[PDB]
Symmetry: C5
């Protein structure tokens, strides 16, 4: 339902990636004579820390005003925001960030520090088992970012489970854990609202099929928050059984 584009109009030199999805599950580097539409979307992966990249970001007409700033590093909190046709999403993992603006024709994503999550999607597109629409891509990314949180949370619980095997712990160790748990909750909560939202807002580029998935992920990430709230309330308890053993 959108205006088709020329392969040139989105050409950045030092662009980490610049792929055209085949719609069958793979990619090919974007050449000047390719057409870009819903069926074959374009994925630009920028490091907003490079010259040509941050230049292209502030200039190119393919973005609204407001997104430029945010796409350039100005956001902190996870949020989905609607720029009419386009959508500006800010996500976090493990704290590393990732800002992307997307409509049905293309996905442009800007990071500074590498995101293990976006690699998995390249590894899969290079192989041929990757996404096919923008909507799919987005799900695959959020799945990944949540796999990561889900694992990293098992690791903290892992450690907190051994501390509960108690010989007291090394001074200030219990705080470095509490700190991490809290950092996690501070960002994993809002990012869940975003997942949940994207599962409700009907965007052109997302199928009822995709929304069922964002529901998965949100509800999943949701349960992760519950396991964190637990871990935290149990580091508050271990700090009282610690100020105790050292009284008797």
């Amino acid at each position: 339902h959108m205006e088709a584009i020329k392969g040139s109009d989105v050409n950045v030199p030092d662009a980490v990636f610049a792929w055209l999805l085949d719609g069958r599950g793979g990619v090919k580097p974007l050449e000047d004579n390719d057409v870009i539409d819903s069926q074959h979307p374009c994925w630009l992966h920028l490091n907003y820390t490079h010259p040509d990249s941050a230049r292209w970001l502030a200039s190119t007409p393919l973005l609204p005003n407001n997104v430029r700033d945010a796409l350039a590093g100005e956001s902190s909190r996870p949020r989905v925001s609607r720029m009419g046709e386009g959508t500006l999403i800010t996500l976090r993992c493990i704290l590393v960030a990732m800002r992307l603006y997307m409509d049905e024709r293309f996905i442009v994503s800007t990071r500074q520090r590498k995101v293990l999550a976006l690699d998995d999607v390249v590894s899969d597109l290079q192989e041929g088992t990757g996404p096919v629409d923008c909507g799919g891509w987005l799900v695959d990314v959020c799945d990944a970012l949540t796999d990561h949180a889900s694992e990293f949370i098992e690791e903290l619980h892992d450690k907190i489970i051994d501390l509960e095997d108690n010989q007291i712990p090394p001074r200030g160790f219990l705080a470095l854990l509490r700190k991490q748990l809290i950092v996690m909750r501070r960002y994993m909560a809002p990012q869940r609202d975003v997942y949940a939202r994207l599962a409700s807002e009907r965007l052109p580029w997302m199928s009822d099929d995709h929304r069922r998935r964002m529901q998965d992920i949100a509800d999943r990430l949701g349960r992760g928050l519950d396991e964190i709230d637990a871990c935290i309330a149990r580091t508050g308890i271990m700090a009282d059984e610690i100020a105790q053993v050292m009284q008797e």
Copy 2:
């Protein structure tokens, strides 16, 4: 499905705003020869504290009897109530209020103190990325009012997290937080029922699309209540580890 109106019949002089939505995402001030229907609804934003405004509120035929009173400041609790065609909704943020009556043709909203939430919707309509139907507007408003609560709750939890780091706190500080938490819960609960309800009642002016969203918001605001119940149960705890450190 409703009777179209003349642009004049809703003309208030000191009316803070008086816009006609274009249905594309923007607005234009209401002139006498504009037509008002589902496609191009009218949004009146009154300060019920001005003469012409409170006058127009009690007079104009475009409102049922019952709403006049409430639109005029008589309500406290968040509530959606149905006046047949129209709907009277009372919402709160951060405690500031906002009463509105709306049907498919128009939205009339009355505040006394400014509501940061209704600005965001003008900022966005002036720009062209705003709502398009009454239904959309209502969601965008509720999204905003909930973004605000959500943040302000992160701020309280922020402070309560530092107090849990613990050198005692300043006398009576822990009560000013408990107080705020409780104030929030007192109003953010009923307001969540309203969200949820609006997500169930099938109004003409709201799409299955919009109801999915009111569900979002409701369930979201819902989780905010949970984070508050926590914050509170943990200020009750910190006041016992305080009567202990002062034991």
Copy 3:
């Protein structure tokens, strides 16, 4: 889908109310030459404590056997029960009761003590913003009964919140609250099951639209129970921080 009735066949003399819904949102007292069907249902509001009323209740053919007893005061717990075409529902508020039997054609409701909830529905029908089908009525009633509980629960929590601001309380005050909370839970729980159920059972007279609503209400009343369970667990705690005095 039911047999139309004559306006006379449901005529009670001291019947508190006896209205015919217009299907537009209002009412008019029932006269002998009115027709009663799905589109214009009849609402009889009896005080089963009056002669003509309790008489008419035990006699009239318009009710099955079993309901007569219950319509007459024999029930305590909230319950929906199916008498084939008709439905017998027992509801409580604030403990005051209200028994009603309804099919698509008419609603007959019996109370002893006045129910603020059923007034609101008259106030609204007299005004013209009231229900239009039996299905709608039932939702509007349950909404009301739940608005009441919801408020009265904020009042208890209100009080329990001040007691948590603690100078000890007046002896035996904390028990009159615990008592109320528990009275509330004893009846507000089963009545939520009823709401939930009505939101599932497909009655002829209720639209998918109305069931979405009974879901609202039930889920709502549901969360009220949660706030009660809290209030109670916190009066059990306040009695230990009191014996600590």
Copy 4:
């Protein structure tokens, strides 16, 4: 969608009941010239403790192998199991049991001790306000079995609420309650899984209408479990405020 049957092929002498549903809401004792199909299902209510009954159970061709054993008393836990066309369900109330196998044509249900729940369905069929399909019957039964648990739970909570009004309790009373609560949970939990499942598995003989109901019931029974978990966690607490009133003595 199943093969119609002769009225004779399911004739048991001492069979507590042996009814043919009219599909309008009532019954009539099964005679030899009645036809049995979806529209008019047959309900056999056996006491597997009688001769002719347990005989008929092990013999008659109208049951698969596997069910015979279980229909005969071999099962303990609530379960729904699929025997292709048929379905074998084991349910419990108040611990009393009830095993039944059913397809669209007929319901055969075996008990040993009387089940107040299955009476209610006879009282209602004799009167004419009872079920009409097998699917409905099954719902009405599970509604009843849950009404019973729901009430009995209010009774335990009732007593546990008075004990929390505390003068100590009679020695060993708090354990007979904890015991009951726990007994309840051990069986009411699995039985809720069964309800929930029946609300998901699409059997021929159950309408989308009936599944909405098994959902009701399951989610209801669900909340009952929650109220039990509470009751139990609060008898664990009352036994510590009791060892306290007997340490401070």
Copy 5:
């Protein structure tokens, strides 16, 4: 919607099983002149510890690159992963594992230690009351794996309920339970995510009917996690009422 196969192309010698589903609820050993499609899928049950089996696993063209490694024992965590047409699922029970790759045409499953769960599905296919599509199979397996967890959790709760009756326990016993509970949670949580997901992702080979079921199972297994979290929080409590009984002697 997929390319039909010859009966030979999937022939392994020491293959524990190698069945063709009849689509009616049973099986027959795979012969060279059988056709394999959605209607009659092929089920290979391999022990990746045998020569011919692990050989066939690394060679045969009927698997993508990535799955070979994992199908061969490389995975630990429960996960569903999509290889385009196919799907690679890793599941655990009671810790024993089971890796499988499946599309609409065939299911290939690899274990090392026997899985009581996959037997039940053979016992039922040999009898004729088993699955009919790949989708059904997958539900029947997960039902089973969850029945097992559900029971084993009742057993730990069982024991934890007796310890709460309380004469102290044998030193280090309460840790062997905590350990088990924790082991269970570590794997039964992620495995629930997989169930839930399979209930959302629309695969060709799963009906809306089957998804309702994976919902069942996921929500069920869900509730088991809740009962574990409880059991654990109550072994943390019993270790404090134990360091208490051993203070005042």
